[PDB]
Amino acid sequence: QRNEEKAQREANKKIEKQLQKDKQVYRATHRLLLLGAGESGKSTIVKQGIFETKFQVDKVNFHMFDVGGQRDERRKWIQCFNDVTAIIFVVASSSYNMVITNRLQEALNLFKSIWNNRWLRTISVILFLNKQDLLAEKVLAGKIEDYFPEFARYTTPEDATPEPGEDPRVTRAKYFIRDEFLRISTASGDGRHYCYPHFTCAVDTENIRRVFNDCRDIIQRMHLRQYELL
């Protein structure tokens, strides 16, 4: 009777001591969700059931999640990832002609569905526009207008950043493709979350510094908005 209560309290204190240790690790780790649209090269990005990976840069722990065990058009499980730091979206920008409703429009529809979600209403998205080299190759080779009629009246932005030795056609193509996502991102945003688009290729090696900087910007903007300074 009297000894039973003492034994119960001894085990509870030991358990609570360990729970304090695990709280430090949980609060210092950043969770990321990786998404893709079919054949998009997202496996190459992570190369260099559910699958989890661990990596660390500048003594900061990141932990990425890739879902491949569930394949459906209704993502009922997506409400679990409402506390992640950011979402990584990988799309192949060079698949406008491929129909196997072409792939680019389906990716745009998926992005629109994800952005306007009741649970993911405060989560930012890091956008990777993969496969740039072969996109430029097929653009140089002898038409986006045959699939995207709005391209017939597009002009390259004045405040653009063309790469060195770049034909002004491929730059217009990339900026058109990026603005397609950017207009959806800015159409229904109230400052609670933003989008960070990047142009990516296979030979890129600085894809982790980009994620680090984008997460830093996300957290800093969150704090600035919280303290009524933004």
């Binding site: 119960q8 309290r9 085990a11 509870n12 358990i15 609570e16 360990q18 729970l19």
Partner: peptide, 11 residues
């Protein structure tokens, strides 16, 4: 849990 005495039993 232990709903009566509010003591964690296992974790």
């Amino acid at each position: 849990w232990d709903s009566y005495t509010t003591n964690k039993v296992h974790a």
